[PDB]
Amino acid sequence: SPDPNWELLSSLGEYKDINLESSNASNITYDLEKYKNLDEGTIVVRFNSKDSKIQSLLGISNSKTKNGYFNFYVTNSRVGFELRNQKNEGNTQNGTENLVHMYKDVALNDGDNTVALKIEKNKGYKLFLNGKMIKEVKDTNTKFLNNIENLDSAFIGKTNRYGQSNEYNFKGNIGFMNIYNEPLGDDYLLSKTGETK
Numbered sequence: 001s002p003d004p005n006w007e008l009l010s011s012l013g014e015y016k017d018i019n020l021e022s023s024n025a026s027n028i029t030y031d032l033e034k035y036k037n038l039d040e041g042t043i044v045v046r047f048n049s050k051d052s053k054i055q056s057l058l059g060i061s062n063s064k065t066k067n068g069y070f071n072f073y074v075t076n077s078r079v080g081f082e083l084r085n086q087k088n089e090g091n092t093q094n095g096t097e098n099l100v101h102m103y104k105d106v107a108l109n110d111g112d113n114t115v116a117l118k119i120e121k122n123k124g125y126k127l128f129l130n131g132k133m134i135k136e137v138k139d140t141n142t143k144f145l146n147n148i149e150n151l152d153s154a155f156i157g158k159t160n161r162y163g164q165s166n167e168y169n170f171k172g173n174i175g176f177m178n179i180y181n182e183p184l185g186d187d188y189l190l191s192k193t194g195e196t197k
């Protein structure tokens, strides 16, 4: 990754017009090899939710575990992500590491919102929403997808988990999702997310 970061970069993944009105997530597991070893990157999502519960925009997980997952989520009044690893499979809490839970209480538009998560390896994390950098966390030992063992699922609109776990099914539409292998420039993220001030 250069310093400063690129202001415009080709996406690793780009997904559009995902209809989640009946809360049936979009399986993007075919792209999993692109993401599973990432130690940094950027995720940009345009969304409109019809619900107030915790809902995954993007869920990347080890479906053989309860708690081995990355969950980029929203509510009606909050955005954030969790990062958790689990070393033991099946119906158990054993071997769970709760790595990061970063979130911010926010005002959302009633219509479309645009959010971004920026991860800079061993620098930190930033959240953007509707043209603002809403939260920055400095961290000299960052964790991301490469820290979750045996990933096997990637979904837009849910997190694929073992057994009876809460999959955080999203209800509404996702206009777009763009995933990058590098941290993008703040100015790019401010303008891009800013399209839905």
Ligand SMILES: CC(=O)N[C@H]1[C@H]([C@H](O)[C@H](O)CO)O[C@@](OC[C@H]2O[C@@H](O)[C@H](O)[C@@H](O)[C@H]2O)(C(=O)O)C[C@@H]1O
Binding pocket: 054, 067, 073, 082, 165, 166
């Ligand atoms: C983003 C978030 O807060 N994730 C939590 C999650 C949610 O809060 C919950 O699923 C929303 O309904 O809860 C997690 O723990 C589940 C666990 O909670 C205990 O209090 C309860 O006794 C258990 O039966 C079980 O529901 C989850 O894994 O889903 C933790 C996660 O970090």
